[model samples]
Target chain A: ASWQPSASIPNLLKRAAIMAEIRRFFADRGVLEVETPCMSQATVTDIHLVPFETRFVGPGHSQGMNLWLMTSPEYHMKRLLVAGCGPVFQLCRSFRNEEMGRYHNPEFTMLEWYRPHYDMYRLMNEVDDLLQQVLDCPAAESLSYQQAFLRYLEIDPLSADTLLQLLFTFGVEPNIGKEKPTFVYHFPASQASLAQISTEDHRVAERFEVYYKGIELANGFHELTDAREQQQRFEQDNRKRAARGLPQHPIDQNLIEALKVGMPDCSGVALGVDRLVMLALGAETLAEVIAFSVDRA
Target chain B: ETASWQPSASIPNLLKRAAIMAEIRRFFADRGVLEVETPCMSQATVTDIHLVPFETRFVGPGHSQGMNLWLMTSPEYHMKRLLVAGCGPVFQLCRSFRNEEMGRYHNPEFTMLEWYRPHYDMYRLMNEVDDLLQQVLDCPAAESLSYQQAFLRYLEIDPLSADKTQLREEEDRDTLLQLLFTFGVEPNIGKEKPTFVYHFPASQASLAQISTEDHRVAERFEVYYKGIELANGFHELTDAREQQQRFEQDNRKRAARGLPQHPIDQNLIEALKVGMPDCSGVALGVDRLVMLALGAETLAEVIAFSVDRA
Candidate 1:
């Protein structure tokens, strides 16, 4: 068979349709689409996430300038929010180091949205609506973290005994201890990470994760507007990194400074757009939705 | 002073306009406008007289996985391949980059609309481009001029003549001709009227061919309004051999100036060999156009984030 180098016409047509639909979904709302720099001076220092580091020649350098392929557009987008962009969204291809699997690609598309005046609950509803529109599917059942765990594994996620039972039931043979989604009005104050603690009860922060078909599709929160609390969370994250034997990253002092200047009461969410596309299209994997997978690159 | 922070109405309006932009793009697709994407990374770099290339880390110790990838200044090089692919017409709105171009109206990274059509010359391309702009801007006819003629009328000198004395004299007559033309000429012509400038000199032609009719000029044009150069279009040069020679010349100049030699894009050359038709293509600066349309004083005002904050 002769080698055909270009993409087939039918595949191209489908790709166009998908892109148009995605754009239309955002445009119909008041979300301003933006393009941010793919490379950054600093990257996510969270120990769990590894960044693909690269270099470019800065204005003065002969050899080059050191930079990192951003793991997520969060830090930069927050900086934009600080600069007075009310509501914004971006569908960008982001990169991560040492991440290649059937469900993961070294480089992947992520649709991240931020609303300056909405909280976690409002953000969730918006995302729910977005998913329905983009996929042209009916409403999806929204399940809480604890509810999902309990429904799938037949064990209460809030109690320590049921948490262990659920883990064992899922065949998660790891040494994670006493980890459960706290359902009390107040959680231990230490767990608030870039999330606002409820005024009614200081311990429980407003945060949620969306899981469908055993996969986590989105993470969102009622963003912590207080600069002091945000700084504490960042420091706690760094502490976690140190405990995990990972290098500590520089805190985004600019974001903290912006918080001090004043960030509107806001909520934000990051969704794996490619994974959602895969689910919606009934594709076997993320590879089918994307034009060029990391393997091809 | 009022302590309450009232949200600006411009934000919602801008968002609405962005939604309209999405609709317009979809409209193009529905009308059978073939949508395409080209490499953000390029083997060959732009040697356009004014555009500057941003260098990236190539394959090395720290960046062993990264190939030599420069943020593309435009999608022109790769999009030209569509002609060889036998696509009659195509369009792409790509994120383009230019180094150190931060200003009230400029960002290092911005969006661009680049499109090409086979068997079409610069005039036909200009008309279509105007139509698209009218649709995008929702406005009427602007204005038009030739490069040499504009220079002659404004600077009172010929651009082609190859006479160093005349060029120097014009530069001396108005040492600020460059800046003034960029800043003053358009407002002087008509403040609100959009104008088009055509018939650039051969020496100034970047990729377009010198017209056989004139021999001293090229079938190229630039559209402007107030003082902004919104778009550039030209009758594309389809000669592979000439294109290769130009690439070599550019590399030689780079080498002579002690700059690193960029890899010549063999793929683009091969596409040209496969044959590109007599066509015209243009690239419009999308962000600047948005800024002008919205009457925003600064690029930061329109953009969600400027490079400094980004």
Candidate 2:
């Protein structure tokens, strides 16, 4: 019946325990837990993502401008970094208008954090430390994005599309992290997404992804701090969105201004908390761990 | 240049807000109030005429026309389901939404601290609220007033005996009393200390059970401080039949007013049928609580990002 909670009582208890444990991990490490708005006036310009849109319906009866449900707490968290908040973390619900699947839900728990004055590699180590404690697994093995494709797919990547296509087509992802958790870092610059381009090798960006049991568990970046470069990337994304007939999102100018005001060099990561709980409890699907999945809700 | 990107709150205020939040959780933890989680969206919502719910459609799997879901106005229904399931003394701190409302004290989206206590009467729960305020706010002891005493004390008029013309000529006695209460009474009572007004008129009971002692009032209470209504609670109604009737009646009234009738929460009704214990529940606006603690004026001054910035 729709009246009952979708997750079993045991699983709900486990979920609660896991959440508490994650909080303790952050608290003990001096990471201040913060909350950002779930709804925003502006949203991500990325073409690959779609945000759930709602209107404010202000004091007047008119339907106001569409406010996008945040796909991630990235922009707002970065703005906090600019404001001189040292190390901050948030465990909040993030929304997306996307497909429902065994692993995908439109609304899901995201554990995101930013570390000022830390490089990408140091952040990755911290992530690995967290995984070892949470998952109770062996030490994670590290590899370059180039090395992963060469070893697993026997190919060298070029463009973002080429890298992504080969990643799924050659079954590279499912084969990884079978023995232990794996970290694949230093992606090609064209596939950087939001990470900074490496000074040593301009061809690659300081980005990394964590994989466990063939699931993409986390994504981290050594953030790009240049305001001009960030603005250019957003404008470039809008042009692509326009070409693809998607809504040209109003850029988050406040975020741009924050960047201009001087954000400390930082590294950040966003982890899927639901997937972690599912893996911890040995559940087959996200619905098993969530109290009320989308369908049940 | 537009400063829309800056946080509405000062960094110090946010830091203080975080400390207070931690303290609240510790207070609950020490008292053994089991914290729980609930969904933000639900199939049905409160039918209160005063509230407007934000809605979105779920287009995923098995539905071609799309499934309509309402952003929960409060976690009242779902938390009650847990009560029926025998999860003892549960509390939830989550976001709740109301559309078409925004101002000094009202935000479309705000954090709520709602909890249920079994085997607790209206006064018993009021004691706990007083304890919470003493611990969190370090304020003087709160004063209590019955609904009748409050109006007589503040406005020098009898709300129960007043007619429409006596209260300002609203179309109905209840409406007139509400307007008069907000304008003439509410801002005046809680000026120096937290004050709890209880035993409201039976006609304005909302979800509370009618007082067995008086029969002319309901066992409901609201906490006010510094002229702001901080919390509302009830000695909850438990009769499945009466509950169903109230829901249906609300829809009827909505229809009569030419407003859209919403789907009644049959799930809550089903849970009510399974039997919820005699309990008291209250939903408190956490942002307002923070504002009071920090001596902030508008909610915008305390919230990191208000709607205008959001």
Candidate 3:
């Protein structure tokens, strides 16, 4: 029944400043800032996300249709790229509609961007530079999926089929840059959600994740542009969904059509702006940075 | 069905709006205006019958009993609370929502540019917006008109002398005058030049301070450009007791219309009693402004994803 805001005005202003700087950062470059719908008729078949559902009725929809809150701006942004928006970025509210934790909120501000020419290497470097400028973090280091598994788990990752047991029961995360910042790249093919397979080995996916102070800050990819492969993933996810006793999911056909029509080769990223801000500002938790978390909103 | 996934705006059009947005920010920074962000969803909402808010429920530690929430129609209330809390001269480009609104110029979800200026009057705030639109769109200074002049010029009715009891029946005098003024007068307002129509009749004063001099008009003004009304501002009504009375009167009107009486935002009333400094504030429809400035034909042409797409 209390009325005061969960965040103080000063903290909210700080968040605003971070916002202004972010816009300025992208503007100085040639990236076109864009917005996409937060509600969708279809969402990712990726089983990791449990979408928050709502009904849409009136004007355009009269049957009281079901719409899912976007778990990420990933697919929608990619759709924009497929339509030939060369370089784009967005800073907007993203909804998850699940649990609330020190690091997780049902709804939070998300920073997503894509570039046409950048590969995983170039994109990762730019992310490091961006973090250094935006959050004032440091230059990052790189390691491969094989090296990471050997160093941390002291075993070959794909050397045997029992890999996921170790991957799940024991996470072999790097400790080299626990306090500093870094990115670990080149995951095994099974780990590539929408990322392309690395050409050199074809055994690993061209993917990387940004980390700082032991917190995973960003997930990115040299995006997969193959329509056939994309549909295969969607169908594969449906099988997994079926095996898990989950309802059948309609594949995102529009994305496949877009890919078939020829999407530009590009790399993209989705960074946790709230977590990055909290890390930079030395806030103990995500709640300290954003204007309102779900509990207080 | 094949076209459903594409954005409402073309890439070129979306880029143009982004440029307009950047320039607006630059204008504020040049004037030393501090930008801020407030929560888009709130515990309560504006009780105005004209706006229907989208509501949702929360289940958390603080709201474990499942508190009901409304998506904000404007950042006006929370922004004012900050002003009282001593955040001087703040501005925000906020996303606001209203249910059951869809048209050529209306979107269920839209952007609002709201700002507060303490130690200022309606005239001062109006001057700043005039400068802003002129700077951004190369528009000229607005011609000022009073409510009395507009009504008389557009419709032949003398507003104050119109049937008093009859005006207050079925629908209020203000609502009727609004129809007459908005339909008959508004479209022709800024044809020659952009216009500012001020000193609204007392019954039409939703939250603006009334003029003690006339006891008939409130210190509120609206801006129009190219026959489209773009902004509504006020020398904000700071009288807590009077605000409470006005809210009650609004509820009475809601009851008569057989609409649910919205819960009054007690927090805003409390913020008012916390000794707010005299201030002038405005909420402008940024989407409409973009459409007007860029000569776009529909609101959807300006917005990336309108409610229909969302």
Model 2: what TM-score? 0.95
lDDT (10s digit) by residue, model 2, range B86-106: 777978888788886579998
Q: Among these predicted structures, which one has the highest TM-score?
A: 2
Candidates 1 and 2, the one with greater DockQ: 2
Candidate No. with top lDDT: 2
Cα RMSD (angstroms) for every candidate in the order listed:
6.4, 2.1, 3.2
Instruction: Name the candidate, 2 or 3, with the larger DockQ value.
Output: 2
Stretches of candidate 2 off by over 4 Å are A59-63, A158-163
Q: Enumerate residue pairs that collide in model 2.
A: A41-B310
For model 3, how does the per-residue alpha-carbon lDDT over A204-233 read when each residue is reduced to its tens digit? Answer: 899888778867788899999999998998
Q: Which candidate number has the best DockQ? A: 2
How far is A85's C-alpha from truth in model 3 (Å)?
Answer: 2.0
Per-residue lDDT of model 3, residues B1-310, tens digit only: 4375566777788889989988989888888888876766667788787877766554435446655667778888777777776778988887777666478888766889999889889999999999988877787887889888887787766676677554343346677877778778887788877799999888888889998788888999999888677899999999889998898888888898888998888877887888678999998999999998788999888887665655
By TM-score, highest first, what's the ranking? 2, 3, 1
The fnat of each candidate, in order, is 0.10, 0.43, 0.27
Mark the regions of model 3 whose C-alpha exceeds 4 Å error after superposition: A55-57, A60-66, A160-176, A199-203, A235-254, B57-68, B164-169
Model 1's CAPRI class?
incorrect
